[PDB]
Design a protein around this ligand. Structure first.
Ligand SMILES: *[C@@H]1O[C@H](CO)[C@@H](O[C@@H]2O[C@H](CO)[C@@H](O)[C@H](O)[C@H]2NC(C)=O)[C@H](O)[C@H]1NC(C)=O
Lengths: 49, 50
């Protein structure tokens, strides 16, 4: 859950692999795109509630 | 006959510099760990919520 620890973006899972004198991690991330604008509001009034 | 005497100055200065280099290495090996923590704290307490 801590951000920017394993991979850039939201983190899903990972795989380790060996190396001559170390380890190599493959991280799977998740990156959104194709945004819009829309229009918001904090709450909705109805019958004074 | 004085080259022997100069050999004492050379080996004194060399040791004086040897101590400085080692002191620098030992001291600079700490700033690395002190800044790695700052980098860790900045990427999670600023870019997100802890
Ligand atoms: C949401 O609306 C904003 C503003 O109405 C868009 O931002 C502008 O986009 C145009 C595209 O040519 C730029 O020329 C402007 O400079 C932008 N505004 C600013 C203040 O820089 C934004 O593109 C819209 N979002 C989407 C997904 O279309």
């Amino acid at each position: 859950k801590r951000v920017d620890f394993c991979g850039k973006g939201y983190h899903l899972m990972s795989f380790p692999q060996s190396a001559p004198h170390g380890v190599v991690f493959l991280h799977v991330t998740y990156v959104p795109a194709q945004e819009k604008n829309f229009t918001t509001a904090p709450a909705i009034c109805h019958d004074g509630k | 006959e004085a080259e022997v005497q100069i050999d004492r100055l050379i080996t004194g200065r060399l040791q004086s510099l040897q101590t400085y280099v080692t002191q620098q290495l030992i001291r600079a090996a700490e700033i690395r760990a002190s800044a790695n923590l700052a980098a860790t704290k900045m990427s999670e307490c600023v870019l997100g919520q802890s």
